[PDB]
Amino acid sequence: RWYPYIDNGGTVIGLTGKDYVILAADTRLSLSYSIYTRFCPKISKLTDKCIIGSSGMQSDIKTLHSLLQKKIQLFVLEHSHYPDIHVIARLLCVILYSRRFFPYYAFNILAGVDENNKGVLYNYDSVGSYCEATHSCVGSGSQLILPILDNRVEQFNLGDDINFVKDAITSATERYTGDKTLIYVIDKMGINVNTL
Amino acid sequence: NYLEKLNFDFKVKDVVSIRDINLEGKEKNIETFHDTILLNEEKNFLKRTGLIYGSQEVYKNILDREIVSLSRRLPGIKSSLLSLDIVRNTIDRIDSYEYMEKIDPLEPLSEIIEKKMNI
Amino acid sequence: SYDRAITVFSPDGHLLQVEHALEAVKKGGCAVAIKSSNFAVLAVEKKNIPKLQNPKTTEKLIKLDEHNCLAFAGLNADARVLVNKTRLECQRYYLNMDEPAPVDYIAKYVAKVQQKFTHRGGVRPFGIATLIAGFKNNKEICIYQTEPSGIYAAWKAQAIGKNAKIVQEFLEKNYQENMEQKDCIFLALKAIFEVVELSSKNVEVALLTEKDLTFIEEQEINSMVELIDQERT
Amino acid sequence: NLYDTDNIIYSPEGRLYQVEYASEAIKQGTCAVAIKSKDYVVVSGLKKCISKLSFPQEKIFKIDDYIGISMSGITSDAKVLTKFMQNECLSHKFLYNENINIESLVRSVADKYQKNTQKSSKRAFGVGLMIAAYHNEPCIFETRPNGSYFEYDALSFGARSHASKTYLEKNLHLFEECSLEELILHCLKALKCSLSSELTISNTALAVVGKNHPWQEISSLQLEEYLSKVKM
Amino acid sequence: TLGPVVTGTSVIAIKYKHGIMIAADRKASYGSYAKFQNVERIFKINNKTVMGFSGELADAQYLHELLTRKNINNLSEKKRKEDMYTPQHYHSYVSRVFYVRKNRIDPLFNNIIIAGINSQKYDNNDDNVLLYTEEYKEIHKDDLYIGFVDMHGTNFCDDYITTGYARYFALTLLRDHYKDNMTEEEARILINECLRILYFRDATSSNFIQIVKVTSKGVEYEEPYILP
Amino acid sequence: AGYDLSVSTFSPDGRLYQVEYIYKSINNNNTALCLECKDGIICCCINSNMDKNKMIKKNSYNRIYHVNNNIIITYSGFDGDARNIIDRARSEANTYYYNFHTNIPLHILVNRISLYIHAYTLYWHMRPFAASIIISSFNEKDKGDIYCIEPNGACYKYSGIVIGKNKEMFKTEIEKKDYKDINVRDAIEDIYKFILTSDDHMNKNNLQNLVNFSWICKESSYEFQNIHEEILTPALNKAVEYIEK
Amino acid sequence: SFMNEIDNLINDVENDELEFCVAPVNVPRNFIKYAQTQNKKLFDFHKGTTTLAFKFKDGIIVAVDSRASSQNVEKIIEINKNILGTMAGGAADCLYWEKYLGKIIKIYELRNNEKISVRAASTILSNILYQYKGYGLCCGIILSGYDHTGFNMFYVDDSGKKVEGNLFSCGSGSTYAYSILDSAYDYNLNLDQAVELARNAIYHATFRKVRVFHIHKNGYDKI
Amino acid sequence: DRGVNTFSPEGRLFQVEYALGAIKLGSTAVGICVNDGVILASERRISSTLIEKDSVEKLLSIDDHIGCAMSGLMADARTLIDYARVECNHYKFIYNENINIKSCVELISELALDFSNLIMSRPFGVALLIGGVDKNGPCLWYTEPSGTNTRFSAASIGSAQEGAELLLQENYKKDMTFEQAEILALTVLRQVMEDKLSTSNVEICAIKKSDQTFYKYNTDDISRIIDVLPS
Amino acid sequence: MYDRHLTIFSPDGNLYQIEYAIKAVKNTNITSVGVKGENCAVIISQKKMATQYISQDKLLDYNNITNIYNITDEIGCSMVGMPGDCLSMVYKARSEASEFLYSNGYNVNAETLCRNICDKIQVYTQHAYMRLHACSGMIIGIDENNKPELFKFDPSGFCAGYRACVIGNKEQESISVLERLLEKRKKETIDEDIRNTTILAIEALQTILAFDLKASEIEVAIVSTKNRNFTQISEKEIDNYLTYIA
């Protein structure tokens, strides 16, 4: 009589671009009410132009990120080239479906920039059915953050998109959203971590 | 992890048997407990021996049991396995797996040799 | 022995065990097969003791499935075991497709099994060289011919067994394309009797059509062997 | 003569034969030389070339950050061992989130050498490897076909190994506390002495690892510059 | 494995200039009996490492045995002093063990804290480790380390970490009064504050306090003392 | 003559030739001294065959390992078999403290290792272990104890034992005086004298590079610890000065 | 090694991608269902959009809307150069088994040099779907394409179903699509009238961005 | 006499050397790894006129972007190609991108050398010549039974390969276009064919850079490239 | 060929591996005598290292050298043979005793232990896979009826009852000698027969081995109804018996 699943919180927002992707997220953790810390890194770096961010329970997302990094390093060492974001997406899908009857409590978002200089963001679910989403978010804030994204993106430079992401996440905190934000951005010359 | 491993074998439906409802999850019911009725007891015995005496005793016991069990007839005709009974010290004991019987149907003898020892 | 390489490479790059299987095949009985249009006559040498032995039990032109059929030369028990394996495999394939098994798939499977017995420990090579005849999924008659080494190749008119080379040369010299049923049966009978004594009791020829494997009656065989005896002189 | 039929039989003098033949197989391999300093370990070596049409067979394999090795024997054994240490390093960095001790990896592979040379129906590996690393200090290791691992300041495998061993022993004191360029020059001179046949960009396999510099094969231009430097 | 029977109350761990200070209360409540009041809560895996718990005693003792054998394996294959694993390694080991037990549906009823120092540039006592029986050196917060492992394997790093009933209300006092690089007197006063509110605002708590320090000298077991 | 080609097969006159092949192999391998003292024990490992190899790092190749930081284990045979037996000793101590919580008594460990080494000398396909392992420990109340399993699987309690090349000469040298009263700090000089005299390969320069040590005595609180070079060097100088005269 | 195995046995201290893990609960087959009693946020999988496939004189029309959380998810997978598979119900299950069926078909086409039949692919997919029936599996697929025995529109589901026909539609609101199709449908229909009928029926289905593809004897177009 | 795994006095496996003795007996095959692609060819050694010449083909497709040529024992080589394509499509399943040629030949090599316990019993006496295009251009590979795989600019396998490799060394040049590669391969073949170079007595498969498809040349294409040869 | 290598019947019978194992037991020349009295059972052996490649040295605690061992608490044993094989057979007898005590709920009997060890050695002899244990035991024990029992087996596996026996070199003529001592026993409190059996066993070893047998080269143990626990008699008491005999 012990359910091995709990909601730890997370509001990983996503936004693509012409040649950039903005996978911002929070750095706050809480069991149900009380907060564990105020700085919990969750955005795990996969490759120099690809990252992953999720709002699931901390143990499953950390194990999944570490396993994906191990598989990517094995792929790099045995093949001597970085995997593509499509390859990483298919690997993540197969990994997630490998545990289908005992699924990961992890809503992944795989962000990156293709070799053809095109930002792509892939939203995921528990089992693995993913989609190429121009704007997406997961977790508790997904009810409140998505319609702003449809209003804005669906209806521009990277600065305006970064400012819109900052305004949206701060509005979400005003509306377990978080207290500090890490605005990751993947330009044409690698990732640039921007604490906020 | 579990449930075998997919390998694009392409032979999923056989003309000898049908898949079980649980496949290989092996849900805990009375038949599952009775399946692991002898493996668990010998696990306890090897635990006792290699704990108190040293793991070399468990090593010698397992190699002797595999060697005497390796000395048996081919699949088909039932093997007496007397030497295994002497080594495991079950010749003095008569138990439920000795008496009773299971009658067993669709597999040719050559498929049984392929299944038993991987040819 | 269990987990022991019975067949291994020799100093001159040859598998001596597979070679021994090859002359074991050559010491076996003869068997001829012809193809034309949409049918394939098949013949095997019959060897029975008169007045004591039962010809009915001695069967060589078995049918594997609805369409494919198999003849063999060499070890009979090995042939029976591989026949059981191939029939079970044909029913497995017909379960997954719900369509009849083509000749090419079962020929490749026979080649795979005969290769496996030449590459696994504790198994000797199969001492037979079976040749399969049947229709593909395209519904075109074709014949394949496996060996103990596992090599297979499509054939138009091939023979096996004792004195195989003489029958192969005769068929290569005399074979025509798009022949009649009587012509095909006559050619098969002449081909097997080139290396077999001319008698009705030493042949059990049957014709494979899309309906079935029809065994030729004894009277037709008697008439044809008498005709061949007349033509010889 | 009669006791070499299996790898579980000792001669009247108490000595294996299959293990010695594996050592001879290592001796038949091509040359490779590595030299350490205070905080830098170069690992160079030749690259086998069967014919003029064939490009050279790559020797160096990177196992992990600050971990790369050179084969001097059978290629399949090298591939299997490289895969095993790759899996071990990635598993250690996965579960514990830290770099693996080089001593632990060397002991683990030497343990596998022990298991595979102990039981019958098995053969010892016909390859020796330079398990070199910078786990907070430059180290070069060597696992033999018999279960055993050794550590040196410099090393050579097979071919004209005597010339490289003589040169390294002669100039062993300059190797400690020297610049990276001097270490590269000395190692390439040792490989040139091993050739006794001239060093080129294709057949040379210069690789550098150490402080603020993970394992990465040097580019063609810098390699050409170094081979010009040793030539004059 | 089935459920909690013999459980502790809380343990408070903080950092300061010379090292970590962590304090239990030496209580093992048998549901509603309070049988024992002298249980050894905070263990010591080796030098510069301490593993506290708050939960079932059997799971914590099993983890203590596992970590002890990991340390003995480490010492058995030791050449340099730097070969000793840091607290991060032990913390990741405990996290992986809890995750594996979570997968098996055999959860370990504990809330672990792993604390210590992840470097050896200050002390030099690990070249000559003695298992069976000067002045304090300042240590930067970067070289210090403390972690957490939950029921579900959730883990993180922070300056101050609490388990059990302390996680609700004592964390507020710690966030209010914590400062970087405190003196031992002020740190002990903060510990006394945390444990007196734990004693007053809980039933299964206690006042027979344990204190243990993890500094450049090593692990120091201060004597038991009753709260004021 | 056929019977000698397998360890399992018995010779006609009741002596397994393979076992004496192990004995010859170990006797033609690196030596290993060890003995007891009033303060504690001292085990020494000398690597003479490395004299040709002028490549080894300074004192990096150590043949003396430890279990639980309480027990010393050393050897003279092949490295891999000895390391396997060492890891078996570590595993035995592991299982003992897991399932009983008390440190393994030494007689338990040496008995289990003795039957483990013997457990390979009654089958046909596994290579027999080629290693003669010396286990040792010292307690204040119990004084000292040094065991030595032979490759056959024969464990005996020794006050002092030497195995390898020139083992007879070293055992003759140790028996000149009773070493029970000689302290551990002073016996290093005598050990240096014996290895410099008995062994021909060891010259004056090689004494510091290719030699290993560890005690268990009261100075280290009866626990494992290697000799610091500041302790070895005066003993080396005194031994060289004495032998030079 | 055997040593480590026995050591782990006495001490009582004991993962390829294609291997499927299961719960240690008493009945793993109902495990997800038990978890659905506890919560539903995790078990909110991306469901597929209703699909409408039908034969006509020249080829086959296959139309499907884009509505998942998402509204631009492709609902048709390329099983083969002539076989196009649909997606309905649980997106992950049908997607993964469509890809795995395509890999089986590629292996069969490689070793056995012949184009596979639509009946064969439908039978294989139904067999593997039935292999994991009872564990919990939601998937609605409409195999459709050409083979040497003419065109074929085989329909398969999680429960091992295999029904041949000429008119099919699966997903949410499939009964409305069936009603409109029975109201208006003819085998001897033009391509323009056929795609107009498909668009009208799909628009009726998702009312109470459509994507349509035309499969022909030499492959399939994207219009 | 001896087991399947026993080192010789010269540190060479006896069974590996015997496997290398068997690969010489076989049909000629030639390949040129020019920048435009790979032109892996074969012999079509016809046993007799009664051979159907449809089921006996030496050039098989491990994948759409991979070509190969078989030599030595033929059923064993078919097993190698079957395992290679199985793991290639497995790689396609796990990873979206098509499998590189290098990784495929590693899978082939670790298939070949698994006969030692380090199940299969004896070594695979086959000498394949894998070739195909991937993201870094064309790549041509080789795997003798000893497992020392190595890439080639141009290579030949089968019986009487000495003349083929000598002529390839004496004619091959860098920056050779695809038609030049075709005529070079046909000239090398005709200068190692015992019989005349007819249209039906040769098999060629091409994996072009732009197309990246396994196109086995038909009768008309073979006839054209035979006709365009020099005197 | 290879008839004498494996446990093969060979021409005209005479399984030769068993004879080679028996000869290997004989080559160790550690004579060990066992004698059965009345409500007592003395087992006596020699504290000497088995003959092998190595040799005894002054730096060796001679008390640790021993051939007499305890199975569980009441049933003792004395293996003479190879070093590893003797203690391995001791551990196998311990395992059989543990099996009996765990399953049947009471202490094992000497007869049942001897038959079980005989069956295990039978499995070793019949199977040529594994080498035969060259170690002949000598088991003593008190039965449930409070009577002594002497027993012995060999590498052949011939478990049989005895009243006085010896294992090791020169075991042929010694069969007569013990009988003569039983003749002296043919012509009393518990301690009286205990002392008589002890001095008779010591005299038997003295007559067989034929030297003084100083107190630091004898290990004596007795199981009687007064005590019933296998305990080794001290050195001083052995010296007292030796002086009393002389």
Structure tokens at G15: 């993962």
Residue among G111, G114, G126, G163 with most chain C CBs within 10 A, to mutate: G114
Instruction: Give the three-state DSSP class for E21.
Output: strand
Q: Do chains B and D touch (3 or more CB pairs under 8 A)?
A: no
With beta carbons under 8 A apart, name residues in chain C contacting B9.
none
Q: Are H25 and H72 in contact (CB under 8 A)?
A: yes
* Rounded distance between C-alpha atoms, residue A14 and residue A185, angstroms: 10
SS3 E162: strand
Token pair, residue G119, equals 């009946």
Show me where chain D is broken: residue before each gap, C-N > 2.5 A: 196
Q: Distance between CA I117 and CA B87 in Å, rounded? A: 10
Closest-CA residue of G relative to H82 is G111
Please check whether residue H14 is in contact with residue H8, taking contact to mean a CB–CB distance below 8 angstroms.
Answer: yes
Domains and CATH numbers, chain H: 4-226 (3.60.20.10)
- Contact state of E66 with G25 under an 8 Å Cβ cutoff: no
Q: Structural domain boundaries of chain D?
A: 1-231
**Amino acid identity for residue C55 in this structure:** P
Q: Are C114 and C152 in contact (CB under 8 A)?
A: no
Domain limits for position I244: 1-246
I125 membership: H or E segment, kind and range: helix I110-126
d(C-alpha I230, C-alpha I42), whole Å: 10
DSSP letter for I171, please: T
Measured between beta carbons, the chain A residues lying within 8 angstroms of E152 are: 4-6, 57-59
> What's the rounded Cα separation, in Å, for the pair I129 and G13?
33
Query: What number of CA atoms fall less than 13 Å from residue A36's CA on the CB side?
Result: 24
CATH class label, C16-232? alpha beta
D24·H11 Cβ contact <8 A: yes
Whether C136 and chain G come into contact, CB under 8 Å, resolves to yes
Measured CA to CA, the distance from residue E162 to residue I138 in angstroms comes to 66
- State whether the Cα torsion B14-B16-B22-B23 is positive or negative: negative
| CA–CA distance, C64 with C131 (Å, rounded to integer) | 12
C-alpha dist (Å) from residue D44 to D61, D79, D159, D185, D232: 12, 19, 15, 11, 19
* Sign of torsion over alpha carbons F54, F59, F62, F63: positive
CB A20 within 8 A of CB A161: yes
Q: Are D134 and D43 in contact (CB under 8 A)?
A: no
Question: Among all chains, which residue has been given the structure tokens 């080379």?
Answer: C165
Q: Which of A78, A81, A86 sits opposite H96 (nearest CB)?
A: A86
Tokens of I209: 């081995």
- Residue that is written with structure tokens 């403290």 in the block: F97
* D133, D63 contact by CB (below 8 A): no
Which burial class, exposed, middle or buried, applies to C176 when counting CB atoms under 10 A from its CB (0-12, 13-18, 19+)?
exposed
* Full DSSP string of C91-135: HHHHHHHSSPPPHHHHHHHHHHHHHHTTTBTT-PPP-B--EEEEE
* Closest residue, chain E, to A57 (C-alpha): E154
Residue G76: name the closest of G89, G90, G62 by CA.
G62
Q: Which chains touch D (3 or more CB pairs under 8 A)?
A: A, E, F, H
Two structure tokens written together for F82? 């000895």
Its domain, for residue A160, covers 4-196
Phi, psi of G30 (to 5 degrees): -95, 5
Among F62, F65, F225, the residue with its CB nearest the CB of E128 is: F225
What's the maximum distance between 2 C-alpha atoms anywhere in chain B? 50
3-state secondary structure of B49: helix
Under DSSP, the state recorded for G28 is G
Separation between Cα atoms, residue F132 and residue A136, nearest integer Å: 68
In chain F, which residues have their Cβ closer than 8 Å to the Cβ of E79?
62
Helix E166-177 × helix E184-200 angle, to 10°: 150
Q: Which residues contact C78 (CB under 8 A, 6 or more apart)?
A: C126, C127, C128
Question: D207-221 b/e with 16+ CB inside 10 Å = b?
Answer: bbbbeeeebeebeee
CA geometry: angle I198, I199, I200, nearest 5 deg = 90
Is residue H222 within 8 A of residue H204, CB to CB? The reply is yes
Mutation target to probe the G interface, by most G beta carbons within 10 A, among C96, C115, C137 is: C137
Question: Hey, what are F26's tokens?
Answer: 């170990």
User: Considering only CB atoms, which chain B residues are within 8 Å of C81?
Assistant: 110
- Number of A:H CB contacts under 8 A? 24
Rounded Cα distance, C130 and C150, in Å: 10
Q: Count Cα neighbours of E125 within 13 Å in the Cβ-side half-sphere.
A: 12
The CA distances from residue E131 to A86, C5, F81, F223, in Å, are 53, 54, 29, 8
Cβ atoms E112, E97 nearer than 8 A: no
Query: Which residues, other chains included, contact D113 with Cβ-Cβ below 8 Å and sequence gap of 6+?
Result: D124, D125, D143, D144, D145, D146, D147, D148, F80
CA D59 vs. chain centroid, Å, equals 9
Q: Which helix (H) or strand (E) holds E199?
A: helix E184-200
Closest Cα to residue C107, out of C139, C146, C160? C146
d(CA I108, CA C21): 59
| CA H169 vs CA A6, B84, D164, H70, H152: distances in Å | 68, 66, 33, 22, 11
Which residue has 């040349």 as its token pair? Answer: H217
Phi-psi label, residue A116: left if phi above 0, alpha if psi -120 to 50, beta otherwise: alpha
**DSSP summary character for residue A151:** I
DSSP state of A195: B
| Cα atoms in the 13 Å half-sphere on the side-chain side of G151 | 23
Long-range contacts of F61-65 (CB under 8 A, 24+ apart): F61/D150, F61/D151, F61/F210, F62/E79, F62/F212, F63/F30, F63/F32, F63/F212, F64/F212, F64/F213, F64/F214, F65/E76
For residues I8 and I16, what is the distance between their CA atoms, to the nearest angstrom? 8
Interface contact G7-F98, CB threshold 8 A: no
Two tokens at G133? Answer: 């029936």
Interface of chain I toward chain F, CB-CB under 8 angstroms: 2, 4-6, 17, 20-21, 23-27, 49-50, 52-54, 57-61, 64-65, 82-85, 87-88, 91, 129-134
The span from the CA of B119 to the CA of C85, in Å, is 13
Angle value at C-alpha D220, between D218 and D224, nearest 5 degrees: 105
Question: In chain E, at which residue ranges do the beta strands (DSSP E only) sit?
Answer: 6-7, 12-16, 19-24, 29-30, 43-46, 49-52, 113-117, 144-149, 155-157, 161-162, 208-215, 218-226
Rounded distance, CA H105 to CA H84, Å?
8
Place of tokens 């040793």: D230
Are I155 and I136 in contact by the 8 Å Cβ rule? The answer is: yes
Tell me the C-alpha distance between F73 and F136, whole Å: 6
Instruction: Measure the CA dihedral A56/A60/A61/A62, to 10°.
Output: 140
Catalytic positions of E: 1
In this structure, chain D runs to a length of 232
> Edge to edge, what strands does the sheet with I138-142 contain?
I68-70, I76-78, I138-142, I148-152, I160-162
Which one is catalytic: G37, G49, G51, G175? G49
The total of structural domains in chain I comes to 1
Distance (Å, whole) CA D12 – CA D10: 7
Comparing CA positions, the residue from I154, I120, I125 lying closest to residue I137 is I154
Residue whose pair of structure tokens reads 């009208």 in the numeric block: G200
CA distances from A17 to A156, A159, D120 (A): 9, 11, 62
Q: What Cα–Cα distance (Å) separates residue D190 from each residue in C10, D36, D227, D229?
A: 43, 13, 12, 14
In angstroms, the CA G189 to CA G172 distance is 26
SS3 A190: strand
CB pairs under 8 A between B and F: 24
Tokens of A83: 């995997």
**Residue B60 and residue F119: Cβ atoms within 8 Å?**
yes
Resolution (A): 3.0
* Residue F122 to chain I, least CA–CA distance (Å): 5
Integer-rounded Cα radius of gyration of chain I:
18
Integer Cα distance of E155 and D151 in angstroms: 39
For residue F154, which of F171, F134, F169, F138 has the smallest C-alpha distance?
F134
Q: What is the DSSP string of D45-76?
A: E----SSSSBPPPP-EEEEETTEEEEB-S-HH
- CA I3 – CA I5 distance, rounded (Å): 6
Distance separating alpha carbons of residues C233 and E135, to the nearest angstrom:
124
Distance in Å, alpha carbon of G19 to nearest chain H alpha carbon: 12
* Among the partner residues A2, A59, A102, nearest to E153 by beta-carbon distance: A59
Task: Give how far C97 is from chain G: nearest CA, Å.
Answer: 5
Q: Within 13 Å and on the Cβ side, how many CA atoms surround G166?
A: 11
Strands (DSSP E) along G65-216, which ranges?
A: 76-78, 83-86, 140-142, 144-147, 150-152, 155-157, 162-163, 167-170, 211-216
Sorted by where each begins, the domain ranges of chain C are: 16-232
In this complex, do E95 and A6 lie within 8 Å of one another by their Cβ atoms? Answer: no
Q: In what order do the strands lie in the sheet with C157-160?
A: C157-160, C31-34, C40-44, C206-208, C213-215
Q: Do B56 and F95 touch (CB under 8 A)?
A: no
* Residue G49 is among the residues annotated as catalytic for this protein: yes
Query: Could you tell me the two tokens for H221?
Result: 């294409």
User: Cβ A70–D86 below 8 Å, yes or no?
Assistant: no
* Residues in contact with C209: Cβ distance below 8 Å, sequence separation at least 6, in sequence order: C38, C39
Task: Report the gap between the CA of H17 and the closest CA in chain D (Å).
Answer: 13
Is H102 part of the contact surface with chain A (CB cutoff 8 Å)?
yes
Give, in degrees to the nearest 5, the angle at Cα H138 between H134 and H142: 100
Mutation choice for A interface testing from G19, G47, G96, G98 by most A CBs within 10 A: G96
Whether the CB of H90 is below 8 Å from some CB of chain B: the reply is yes
Give the Cα separation of H160 and H195 in Å (integer). Answer: 14
Three-state SS annotation for chain F: CCHHHCCCCCCCCCCCHHHHHHHHHHHCCCCEEEEECCCEEEEEEECCHHHCCCCECCCCCCCCEEECCCEEEECCCCHHHHHHHHHHHHHHHHHHHHHHCCCCCHHHHHHHHHHHHHCCCCCCCECCCCCCEEEEEEECCCEEEEEEECCCCCEEEECEEEECCCHHHHHHHHCCCCCCCCCHHHHHHHHHHHHHHHCCCCCCHHHCCCEEEEEEECCCCCCCECCCHHHHHHHHHHHHHHHHC
A185 CA to chain H: closest CA distance, Å? 25
Vertex C19, ends C17 and C27: CA angle to 5°? 110
Inter-residue contact A138 to A123 (CB < 8 Å): yes
> Which residues lie closer than 8 Å to C189 by C-beta, 6 or more apart?
C43, C203, C205, C221, C224, C225, C228
Q: Which helix (H) or strand (E) is I23 found in, with range? A: helix I16-27
- Cα distances from E7 to residues B2, E149, E162, F56, in angstroms, run 35, 17, 16, 56
Chain G hits for E104, CB-CB cut-off 8 Å, are: 24
Q: Scan for tokens 């032995």, then name that residue.
A: C53
Q: Which positions in chain B touch G22 (Cβ < 8 Å)? A: 1-3, 25
A:G CB pairs within 8 Å: 67
Which residue from C32, C9, C48 is spatially nearest to C168, judged by alpha carbons?
A: C32
Residue B8: its chain H contacts at CB < 8 A? 86, 89-90, 93
User: Contacts of residue A87 in chain H, CB cutoff 8 Å?
Assistant: 95-97
Q: Which residues contact C185 (CB under 8 A, 6 or more apart)?
A: C41, C205, C207, C216, C220, C224
Q: Which helix (H) or strand (E) holds C153?
A: strand C153-155
| CATH architecture type of domain D1-231 | 4-Layer Sandwich (3.60)
Q: Are strands H205-208 and H131-134 parallel, antiparallel or unpaired?
A: unpaired
Could you tell me how far CA E82 lies from the centroid of its own chain?
A: 22
Task: Give yes or no for G27 touching A (CB within 8 A).
Answer: no
Q: Do G24 and E105 touch (CB under 8 A)?
A: yes
- Cβ atoms < 10 Å from Cβ of D1: 6
Q: Name the CATH superfamily for F1-239.
A: Aminohydrolase, N-terminal nucleophile (Ntn) domain (3.60.20.10)
Structural domain count, chain A: 1
Cβ contact H–E (≥3 pairs, < 8 Å):
no
Which of G7, G12, G13, G31 has the highest number of chain E CBs within 10 A, making it the mutation to test binding with E?
Answer: G13
Report phi then psi at D121, rounded to 5. 60, 35
| Contact flag C104-G112 (C-beta cutoff 8 Å) | yes
Note whether A58 contacts E: Cβ–Cβ < 8 A: yes
Yes or no, beta carbons of H149 and D54 under 8 Å apart: no
